[PDB]
Amino acid sequence: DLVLTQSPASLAVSLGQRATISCRASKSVSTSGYNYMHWYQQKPGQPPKLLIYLASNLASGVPARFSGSGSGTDFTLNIHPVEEEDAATYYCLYSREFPPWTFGGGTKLEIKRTVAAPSVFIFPPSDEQLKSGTASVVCLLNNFYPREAKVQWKVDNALQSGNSQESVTEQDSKDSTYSLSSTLTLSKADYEKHKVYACEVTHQGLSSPVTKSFNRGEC
Amino acid sequence: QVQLQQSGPELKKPGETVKISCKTSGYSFTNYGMNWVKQAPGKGLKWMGWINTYTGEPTYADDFRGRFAFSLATSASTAYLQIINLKNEDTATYFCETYDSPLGDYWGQGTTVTVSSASTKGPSVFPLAPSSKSTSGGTAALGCLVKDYFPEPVTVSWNSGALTSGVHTFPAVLQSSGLYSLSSVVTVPSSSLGTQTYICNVNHKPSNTKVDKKVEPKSC
Numbered sequence: 387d388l389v390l391t392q393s394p395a396s397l398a399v400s401l402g403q404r405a406t407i408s409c410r411a412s413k414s415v416s417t418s419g420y421n422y423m424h425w426y427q428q429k430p431g432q433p434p435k436l437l438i439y440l441a442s443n444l445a446s447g448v449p450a451r452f453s454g455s456g457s458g459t460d461f462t463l464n465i466h467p468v469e470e471e472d473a474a475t476y477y478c479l480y481s482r483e484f485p486p487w488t489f490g491g492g493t494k495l496e497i498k499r500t501v502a503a504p505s506v507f508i509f510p511p512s513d514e515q516l517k518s519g520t521a522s523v524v525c526l527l528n529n530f531y532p533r534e535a536k537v538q539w540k541v542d543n544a545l546q547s548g549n550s551q552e553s554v555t556e557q558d559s560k561d562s563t564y565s566l567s568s569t570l571t572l573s574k575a576d577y578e579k580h581k582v583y584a585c586e587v588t589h590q591g592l593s594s595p596v597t598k599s600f601n602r603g604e605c
Numbered sequence: 606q607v608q609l610q611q612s613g614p615e616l617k618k619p620g621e622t623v624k625i626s627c628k629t630s631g632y633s634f635t636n637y638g639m640n641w642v643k644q645a646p647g648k649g650l651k652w653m654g655w656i657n658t659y660t661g662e663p664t665y666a667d668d669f670r671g672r673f674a675f676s677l678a679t680s681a682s683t684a685y686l687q688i689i690n691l692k693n694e695d696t697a698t699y700f701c702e703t704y705d706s707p708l709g710d711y712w713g714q715g716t717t718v719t720v721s722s723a724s725t726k727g728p729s730v731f732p733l734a735p736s737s738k739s740t741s742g743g744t745a746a747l748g749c750l751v752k753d754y755f756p757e758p759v760t761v762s763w764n765s766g767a768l769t770s771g772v773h774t775f776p777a778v779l780q781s782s783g784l785y786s787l788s789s790v791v792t793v794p795s796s797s798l799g800t801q802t803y804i805c806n807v808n809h810k811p812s813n814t815k816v817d818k819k820v821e822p823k824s825c
């Protein structure tokens with residue numbers, strides 16, 4: 387049977403530098419004289435897109451910065467210079483004119499850029515939600531790098547826990563940054579029990595933690 | 606040139622069966638046939654198998670025997686993927702593809718299938734008002750909180766598509782209630798909070814819910 391394993395699983399490469407991805411086949415795919423290795427690129431929320439077919443030929447509408455090499459069992463996909471729009475997952479694919487097909491496990495590619503601090507904002511609950519019995523307080527961290535970030539909620543300066551959730555956007559294909567949203571959910575009752583709601587952010591782009599807050603009733 | 610459109614997202618309970626469609630822009634699928642690919646949330650691509658366009662003879666990959674069936678409804682150059690006795694492990698996005706040559710590779714945008722016992726439920730849309738607390742420099746941030754819905758997905762656009770710059774719609778989080786929640790925000794000129802109107806358009810097909818929430822400024 388044929389299995390393809392890719393190296394590495396993840397890779398972070400500086401904008402403008404070279405990205406090298408590998409794929410090894412459990413057995414030779416060049417015995418017929420042709421190199422049956424293909425490469426696909428897939429960005430979040432989109433279907434795969436062919437980049438290279440037959441180990442080294444560029445697919446349709448693929449910039450020359452992408453290239454491929456190898457034969458037998460070892461192949462590599464090369465990107466140079468890496469651009470922000472290249473943040474994606476890359477898969478090698480084995481197959482002849484007709485199937486079967488065998489995909490490799492994939493290689494996530496993150497674009498590395500200069501550190502950037504997040505812009506922090508906070509949103510007190512809306513009147514209509516409060517009216518329905520709950521209170522959601524949202525904290526937004528906009529356009530930052532690297533992805534590593536820490537958000538702490540404090541109600542009347544008391545660190546909250548187990549009552550908040552967050553999601554980070556995929557790396558921006560334009561400027562290579564991230565954005566994060568954190569939601570502190572509380573019952574109307576609980577919410578009206580306290581006065582100060584704050585979001586405290588720590589990111590290697592901030593000299594010292596930044597805090598955003600408001601007082602219930604102020605807004 | 607060619608383009609495959611697939612049927613929308615589906616919600617089924619375990620044990621049920623689901624049937625997804627793939628339609629070409631051309632008048633039929635090429636001589637090479639058609640392929641189906643599976644992608645579980647956050648996982649890799651996995652070839653399911655293929656079906657011959659002429660012989661209608663399907664071939665299934667090892668890990669996809671018994672419960673899966675590829676069918677050709679040539680009646681309108683359409684192909685179908687059927688899965689019976691749905692399990693949790695079937696929760697994934699299914700892609701259909703076909704090719705006429707090395708340079709002619711066409712993919713469908715995939716059909717997201719969700720296997721769960723949870724009931725469908727439209728979201729509530731709450732405004733994330735811009736104010737002194739969501740302003741920095743000349744930029745003001747504002748948004749919409751789409752809370753308590755099931756199943757995925759939800760789409761959000763701003764001012765019917767007019768505003769798209771600086772828009773950030775985050776990945777939905779699954780709350781302890783088993784319901785999803787998501788937020789969509791946008792940064793717009795602080796002064797343009799007296800010259801412009803801002804409305805988020807939320808669409809949650811699974812429950813046929815369409816909401817338009819105008820987001821107004823808050824003084825404090």
Ligand SMILES: COC(=O)[C@H]1[C@@H](OC(=O)c2ccccc2)C[C@@H]2CC[C@H]1N2C
Pocket residue numbers: 420422424436439440479481482483484704705706707708709710
């Ligand atoms: C002609 O076959 C293809 O188009 C295949 C592939 O090419 C070949 O396998 C191939 C074999 C012999 C000659 C030319 C191309 C490129 C991509 C990946 C699978 C499939 N295509 C979508």
